[PDB]
Amino acid sequence: FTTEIHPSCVTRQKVIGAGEFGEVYKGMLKEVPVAIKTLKAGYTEKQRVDFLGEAGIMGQFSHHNIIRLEGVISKYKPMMIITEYMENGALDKFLREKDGEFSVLQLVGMLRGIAAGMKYLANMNYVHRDLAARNILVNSNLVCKVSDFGIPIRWTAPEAISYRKFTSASDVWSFGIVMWEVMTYGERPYWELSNHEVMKAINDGFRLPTPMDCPSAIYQLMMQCWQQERARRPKFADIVSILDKLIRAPDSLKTLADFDPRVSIRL
Numbered sequence: 001f002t003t004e005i006h007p008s009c010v011t012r013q014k015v016i017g018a019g020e021f022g023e024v025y026k027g028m029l030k031e032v033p034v035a036i037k038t039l040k041a042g043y044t045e046k047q048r049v050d051f052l053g054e055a056g057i058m059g060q061f062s063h064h065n066i067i068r069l070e071g072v073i074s075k076y077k078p079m080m081i082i083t084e085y086m087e088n089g090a091l092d093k094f095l096r097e098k099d100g101e102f103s104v105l106q107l108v109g110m111l112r113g114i115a116a117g118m119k120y121l122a123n124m125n126y127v128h129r130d131l132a133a134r135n136i137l138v139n140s141n142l143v144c145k146v147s148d149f150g151i152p153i154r155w156t157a158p159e160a161i162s163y164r165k166f167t168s169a170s171d172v173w174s175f176g177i178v179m180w181e182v183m184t185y186g187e188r189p190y191w192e193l194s195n196h197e198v199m200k201a202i203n204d205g206f207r208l209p210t211p212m213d214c215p216s217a218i219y220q221l222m223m224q225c226w227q228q229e230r231a232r233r234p235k236f237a238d239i240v241s242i243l244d245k246l247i248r249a250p251d252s253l254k255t256l257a258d259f260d261p262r263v264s265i266r267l
């Protein structure tokens with residue numbers, strides 16, 4: 001079952017995005033701010049199954065680091081999925097607009113939240129397939145929650161690219177990329193390299209270099225997420241455990257990995 005909301009309780013205020021066959025609005029629910037995704041007239045059977053299926057999954061999950069469902073409008077048209085509203089929006093854009101404004105402890109806290117959400121999804125037998133900072137939302141407490149706005153080569157594990165093997169372990173690879181995104185304040189993974197250049201580089205053993213001002217322990221962890229051999233990657237359980245220990249003994253984060261400068265200025 002999913003909480004059914006009457007349309008009279010919902011007010012759409014502004015368009016903030018696009019759905020698969022409909023739009024996404026900021027609005028109010030009788031009052032609390034909400035995000036609202038619509039499915040407009042003409043939708044196919046597949047679209048309806050996918051839309052209500054997504055809502056169903058969201059309504060069963062209950063975790064601090066997973067987007068919360070307020071409810072669904074299924075009995076009237078257009079159909080709607082209504083979620084909590086995350087005031088700071090998508091993590092990738094947020095970090096790029098707030099470059100350098102957070103402490104290392106705050107950044108690592110973000111990652112621990114994301115990891116906790118992913119551990120929950122993985123153990124509930126849900127494989128994300130598109131984990132990236134663009135699909136993480138941020139609220140006014142700086143809490144990060146896993147979402148999905150709809151192959152993204154540079155986030156995807158080799159086995160998922162090569163033979164379509166998507167698992168919690170391919171999500172761990174992606175999480176490594178997300179760690180690099182957070183610690184660089186939203187740098188594009190692999191910079192201007194083309195998709196084929198990225199795939200070639202990874203196959204030949206290249207990995208993203210240390211971010212600036214990055215704790216050694218954090219760089220070590222993201223490198224383990226990028227083991228070629230799936231079985232050698234940490235589980236989300238391991239990641240949550242390590243990040244929790246680092247945060248609870250925060251002097252552990254004061255030791256930095258060496259940053260490899262591209263340009264050296266001699267004065």
Ligand SMILES: CNc1ncc2cc(-c3cc(NC(=O)NCCC(C)(C)C)c(F)cc3C)c(C)nc2n1
Nearest residue numbers: 035036037058067081083084085086089146147148
């Ligand atoms: C800008 N703030 C904000 N806050 C909250 C927002 C919530 C949504 C949202 C997102 C989804 N879907 C969605 O989050 N799917 C993944 C769910 C899972 C992690 C449990 C597997 C949805 F079905 C409906 C809506 C309204 C979207 C598309 N945008 C949002 N934007």
